[PDB]
Design a protein around this ligand. Structure first.
Ligand SMILES: O=C(CO)[C@@H](O)[C@H](O)[C@H](O)CO
Ligand SMILES: O=C(CO)[C@@H](O)[C@H](O)[C@H](O)CO
Ligand SMILES: [Mg+2]
Ligand SMILES: [Mg+2]
Ligand SMILES: [Mg+2]
Ligand SMILES: [Mg+2]
Lengths: 283, 283, 285, 285
């Protein structure tokens, strides 16, 4: 159950191969973070032994995240989804990760053009119920990330995520919020935190344009005050799309640079967020 | 246990004589509030039975507030402070009030030019302990309002108010915050609410210039989100200095109109605050 | 050029057919707005005489907006775009509208999957240059609306929109910003207004979730102070998708109600916005 | 005249004695600011030639500010006030300072208990007109700082400061705003900047509790967007009362530490403010 400050390793690696894992872990140490979030674009290819050894040796905690590929979108292909999640759960457990989070209930790019249906939600609950069983067997939790309306039409708000967790009735699925998505979806950004308060264990601290935290439109004081007020003790994960590989960036609608360089994003954004977390007593 | 929305009657009445009480109660009904806060500038002159019958007839709840006059400033004249507060506490209870709140520990205009001393605080604590016993005997609570540095040098922040409540050791003293004061004093406005969370039962929703809520510098989204997040269930009291009698106005450094007219303040401010309360789930 | 307060008619009707025009115009008058913004999504279907009669009878001004259908996306099918824009311009002018604005350079839901290219912009400029000549012939101006990265890949910021206006070199194209889009795209919302100031004549005061203004994440105090500071004097227009025009639903991505109903958005959002304009002393208030 | 970033020297010393100036100038160069604001609260104690030598060898600009002592409040004792200002003006000029700003029209802590009267403003205008001519004699400008209702009852807003400037009619008096004070007095912080835009040459970027900028309640994005929008090009100065000059402690009301220490305020506040000025494209950053 993640605690403290971490970073999504997108800024150094989206391909978690051997040199990529090395590079990301090194950056994590340079910035003195408490954990890393490992994107698993291709869970089969991950060398669990190498990553486990790296995390243990540097006393770094980790969790993993993914989005389901189209061949495995839970809403329409629930059997493939369960298969894909079971592989990723095993990989996360093996490398020492404490959770698999993200868009584990569908894909980036899902859109029917109409509101989400009970049939879609039924398939998703089937998938999550099975994956949660499997995750319990490996000693990890699952995280359901609310993302904005353009990426997925099924779970966009903290309240929708909580409704899905109530539908599944498991005890090892938590809510994962992202300030970039909440900046679009939440009716006042604090309401996403309020609505998920009983299940919120992880939040991406990401600026409104995916650039440098502190230098966009996210309401950071409301965000941090509300996290402190609900007693949030989970993971604070800085995320920025700076230096993302072009192929991955284009898929997430990055048509232009989100910030100047890593020096700008990490050198201004990370102190901003740590200072805010101290200011409001999260630490 | 004050609940819901109310108004400080200074917008219609600072002199709580018979016609003043009638006028304020009439306004309260028009704006459909749940309670009124009655300023008690001259507690001996209050007709308790008239006001009690007005409140019971109109299903309206009430609390009273005051600041201590200089002859009874608790920090330096605690015996006179106790005598003054007993009179106000009895009048408050006799009229049907549920609490006496405000600057019950000192006065507007206290300033030594140096930090508050332990001797000052010892005198305040003795006064408030005697007052709390007297209040307990009449079935009411006391509220300690944090006010800004220019009005009083002793209790300016939520954390300072809680400290005094802990020094006193009574269980019937609560913290009373005011967004106008917090806008100056709190290191991020939500931190006053967070620091006071265990004892917070009343908040003045006042704009940064004492004018129209919604049209100043107060961070309303952070305020309401943090209230909701700490589970606040006490009194939400609108306060504006519009139409205050000039003698009282000048005493609080109102050197110019805070707003056009009551129509602006109540017509724009009260909907703004009620809409925010609904937005963040306080209602 | 538009002044005062207005409303995008999705507040009141899905389509600009005859009963939709009757309903929207009646609602607009109830709220004492100065103008309405009418979607030009099915030009051959618009009964221009019926709408112009309604507008002139009730002393309501209007402009139109659209997104281009994929058959006529300017970036890839510029000749189809020109023809489509000429029809939309003529219908806009025939009903008495004073400008045609919005995503007039592409689709709502347009994306190639890669960043925008010079070849795409070269085509858009050709299209807008031809369209702006046609608009001038009918006495109306054109507006280019910056929309967020998920709705179009070509013009997302005030500075991009201004670069397109500079690339075209016309005298009758303005910039149209939208607080909902700037909430995503601008590095500090005021920056979109600053970057666009020389050409900004129309702004959608749309809440961050397309809901009720004042009850989302938009930085309204920053928005209004910056509009006042640059001396904005064009149209202030609400946009809340209480009703969703079918031809743009897929791209606008409203999958759940933006608010309880039109009464809530108009009854709470419009007074908030009018009160903010007065607070910051906006020209015309 | 003043450009770029600067710091009120209460950041580093309580008094402007010889050792205090050693320290402040040293710090100012550690943080690579462009200027310092020196309190002229104790003129007979200021070694002007020593400070002036430090400023030139360290390539550092300066201005001074003050509040008037009660014996010389321009409101009630105008002839005293003129004499006090001429001395403060002369010593400011002697040490290399380019303006004398602040509460030059009254006391920090001045109040009558009643709203300001026309007689009071008459006296202030007479004082400032006299003072302004003496200031021109020495080649420096005067600044009128709006402060909050609890520190002075006469000039609390941008608009009031402009009205006093327009009354005096002098070419060499600017408006000085302070975000700490505007946080209380302005009905929307950007309105103070808007109202003062024709005369605004200096702003204190001071947090709402006089602590670390970025970590209080000031609406920084609105502040910086509005400064960019009006084309602000004057001094951007920090003010945090780590140290408190004794002459003004009673009126400034710092009864507890504003922040952990100077390292926290400068180490977190200055990068925040520099980053914001760049974010909004402020002239010179
Ligand atoms: O804000 C937008 C695009 O997201 C709309 O203004 C669009 O141009 C309009 O709906 C067409 O009528
Ligand atoms: O902001 C203020 C007044 O509160 C100060 O700038 C004051 O004028 C200065 O301390 C005098 O040097
Ligand atoms: Mg995320
Ligand atoms: Mg109060
Ligand atoms: Mg729009
Ligand atoms: Mg100042």
């Amino acid at each position: 159950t993640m605690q403290g400050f971490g970073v999504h390793t997108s800024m150094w690696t989206m391909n978690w191969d051997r040199p990529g894992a090395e590079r990301a872990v090194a950056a994590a140490l340079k910035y003195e973070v408490d954990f890393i979030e490992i994107p698993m674009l291709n869970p089969p290819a991950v060398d669990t032994e190498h990553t486990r050894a790296l995390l243990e040796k540097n006393e770094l905690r980790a969790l993993c995240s993914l989005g389901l590929p189209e061949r495995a979108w839970a809403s329409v292909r629930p059997d493939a989804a369960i298969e894909h999640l079971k592989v990723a759960i095993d990989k996360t457990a093996d490398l020492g990760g404490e959770a698999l989070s993200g868009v584990i209930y569908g894909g980036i790019g899902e859109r029917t053009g109409v509101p989400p249906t009970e049939a879609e939600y039924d398939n998703i609950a089937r998938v999550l119920s099975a994956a949660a069983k499997h995750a319990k067997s490996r000693g990890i939790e699952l995280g359901v990330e609310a993302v904005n309306r353009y990426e997925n039409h099924l779970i966009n708000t903290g309240w929708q995520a909580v409704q899905m967790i109530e539908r599944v009735g498991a005890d090892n699925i938590f809510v994962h919020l992202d300030t970039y998505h909440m900046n679009i979806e939440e009716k006042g950004v604090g309401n996403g935190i309020l609505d998920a308060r009983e299940h919120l264990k992880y939040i991406h601290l990401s600026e409104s344009d995916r650039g440098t935290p502190g230098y966009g439109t996210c309401g950071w004081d409301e965000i941090f005050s509300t996290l402190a007020a609900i007693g949030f003790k989970g993971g604070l994960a800085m995320e920025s799309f700076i230096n993302m590989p072009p192929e991955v960036a284009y898929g997430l609608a990055v048509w232009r640079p989100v910030a100047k360089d890593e020096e700008e994003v990490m050198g201004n954004g990370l102190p901003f967020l740590r200072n805010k977390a101290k200011q409001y007593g999260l630490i």
